[PDB]
Amino acid sequence: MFDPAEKYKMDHRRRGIALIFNHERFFWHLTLPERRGTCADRDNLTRRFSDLGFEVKCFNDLKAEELLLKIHEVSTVSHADADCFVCVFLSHGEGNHIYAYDAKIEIQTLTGLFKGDKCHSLVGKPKIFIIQAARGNQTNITEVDAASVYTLPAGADFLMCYSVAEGYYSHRETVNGSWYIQDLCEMLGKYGSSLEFTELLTLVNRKVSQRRVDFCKDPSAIGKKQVPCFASMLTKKLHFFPK
Amino acid sequence: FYKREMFDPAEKYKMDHRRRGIALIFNHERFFWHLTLPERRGTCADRDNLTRRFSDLGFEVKCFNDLKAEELLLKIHEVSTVSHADADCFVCVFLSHGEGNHIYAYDAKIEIQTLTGLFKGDKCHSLVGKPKIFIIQAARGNQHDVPVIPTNITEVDAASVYTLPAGADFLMCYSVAEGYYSHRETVNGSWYIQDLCEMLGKYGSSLEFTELLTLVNRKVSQRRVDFCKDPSAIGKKQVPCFASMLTKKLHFFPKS
Numbered sequence: 001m002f003d004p005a006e007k008y009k010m011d012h013r014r015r016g017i018a019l020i021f022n023h024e025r026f027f028w029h030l031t032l033p034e035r036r037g038t039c040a041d042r043d044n045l046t047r048r049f050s051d052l053g054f055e056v057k058c059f060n061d062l063k064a065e066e067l068l069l070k071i072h073e074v075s076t077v078s079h080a081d082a083d084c085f086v087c088v089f090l091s092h093g094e095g096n097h098i099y100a101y102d103a104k105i106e107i108q109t110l111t112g113l114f115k116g117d118k119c120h121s122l123v124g125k126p127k128i129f130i131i132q133a134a135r136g137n138q139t140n141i142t143e144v145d146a147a148s149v150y151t152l153p154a155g156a157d158f159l160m161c162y163s164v165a166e167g168y169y170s171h172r173e174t175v176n177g178s179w180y181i182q183d184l185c186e187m188l189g190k191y192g193s194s195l196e197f198t199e200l201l202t203l204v205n206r207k208v209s210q211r212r213v214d215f216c217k218d219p220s221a222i223g224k225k226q227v228p229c230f231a232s233m234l235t236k237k238l239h240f241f242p243k
Numbered sequence: 244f245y246k247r248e249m250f251d252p253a254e255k256y257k258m259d260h261r262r263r264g265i266a267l268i269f270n271h272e273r274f275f276w277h278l279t280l281p282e283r284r285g286t287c288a289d290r291d292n293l294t295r296r297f298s299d300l301g302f303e304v305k306c307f308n309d310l311k312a313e314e315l316l317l318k319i320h321e322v323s324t325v326s327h328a329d330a331d332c333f334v335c336v337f338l339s340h341g342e343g344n345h346i347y348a349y350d351a352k353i354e355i356q357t358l359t360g361l362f363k364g365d366k367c368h369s370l371v372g373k374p375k376i377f378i379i380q381a382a383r384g385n386q387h388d389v390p391v392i393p394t395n396i397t398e399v400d401a402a403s404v405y406t407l408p409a410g411a412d413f414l415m416c417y418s419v420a421e422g423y424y425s426h427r428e429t430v431n432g433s434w435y436i437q438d439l440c441e442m443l444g445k446y447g448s449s450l451e452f453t454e455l456l457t458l459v460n461r462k463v464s465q466r467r468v469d470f471c472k473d474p475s476a477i478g479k480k481q482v483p484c485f486a487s488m489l490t491k492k493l494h495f496f497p498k499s
């Protein structure tokens with residue numbers, strides 16, 4: 001019958017793939033600023049997800065064609081033996097788009113590759129996108145970017161996680177990494193293997209939104225609060241218990 | 244514990260105020276002819292269903308039928324400016340058609356950000372740190388009716404309203420996501436609202452609210468239309484979603 005506490009079956013041979021697309025620099029014609037600190041984010045995410053059982057694959061500064069090719073490749077292999085799929089974007093963005101090295105890519109194109117009829121072996125399984133992307137400004141310094149990327153939904157069993165909501169600001173420390181990724185990774189490390197994942201994301205919401213912007217080193221950044229959000233199309237409770 | 248102090252993985256919104264709070268329902272069944280929008284038969288079932296479920300959870304429910312945009316704005320501004328100091332939370336429901344960042348009132352559209360903006364920070368100080376929950380059943384009205392002055396059937400409308408976020412401690416709940424379709428039975432009401440209300444009744448007073456919304460996601464996305472009744476509705480799946488800016492666990496336990 002109908003089960004109020006039903007969980008995604010996470011008893012497969014493998015947890016699954018976690019893809020990370022990391023962008024630090026951009027083709028000069030795009031006139032986008034470098035993203036110092038993003039490599040800290042990449043490393044942090046890599047440890048957390050690998051500790052959760054994911055097979056983590058990182059890609060640095062791919063051109064759009066290369067990026068599309070790689071994600072299409074992954075969408076077309078069998079995930080039959082996997083619990084789930086994770087995809088992380090660390091870049092600048094605008095509207096429905098995230099930037100690769102040389103051009104933008106639509107988020108809907110990326111998520112569309114993992115919808116039911118495109119990726120049968122992921123049907124009914126969690127498909128999690130984590131997006132750290134905002135408006136590029138055209139030792140440890142905090143850079144502040146206006147929210148620009150739409151907090152888009154996707155298909156059933158997708159979970160779309162965004163560093164920042166409309167009207168707020170994304171922060172990135174050049175040594176320590178992004179506020180959002182730091183707090184996400186801290187929560188993953190402590191609670192990732194026990195807490196329901198949207199419960200955990202809610203903790204991240206609290207952590208990030210409570211960071212004070214009262215007295216920034218850069219006075220221009222005062223009052224520029226960060227509020228993350230996630231859009232859930234999940235249909236069951238999601239845990240990452242040790243396999 | 245003996246007394247608490249640190250970062251708590253299981254922190255819950257404090258729901259021990261004198262009152263649960265206000266639940267606003269804006270119910271729109273018909274529209275000014277110049278808008279060229281179809282009527283929304285079944286929405287009154289949705290309104291009544293929601294009224295019962297939220298009142299059982301302790302909310303003070305106020306319904307408004309077919310308000311003009313100016314009246315709507317006035318009313319919600321009125322609620323945003325009173326003191327919610329004695330309240331746990333705030334709920335606002337829109338039952339209408341919509342487009343992009345807009346929801347239709349009787350005579351004009353209103354931007355969702357205009358509505359949520361009224362309840363941010365010191366615009367509504369007494370709701371700061373409290374759940375502010377918007378539930379939006381709004382999609383694209385099928386316009387095969389004229390620009391002139393004018394049984395249980397399932398109407399199927401394309402998703403049209405952006406699944407917009409808002410401020411901290413907002414929870415924005417949407418009947419349908421981009422690329423899918425919202426369904427409304429002309430007697431029984433909307434798929435989304437029916438399933439939301441059933442889950443509220445069975446689990447609302449114990450389940451964490453986003454967990455409950457996740458149940459609604461499952462219920463709705465698994466619904467099929469009777470192939471013989473409307474073949475055109477084949478492949479028009481409904482996938483709801485919610486955008487959470489919540490910072491704590493939200494329960495509606497019976498108030499003492």
Ligand SMILES: Cc1cccnc1NCc1ccccc1O
Nearest residue numbers: 147148149150151166405406407
């Ligand atoms: C068009 C849209 C679709 C879904 C969600 N939000 C959308 N627009 C609002 C918006 C603007 C800037 C940054 C984030 C953000 O969410």
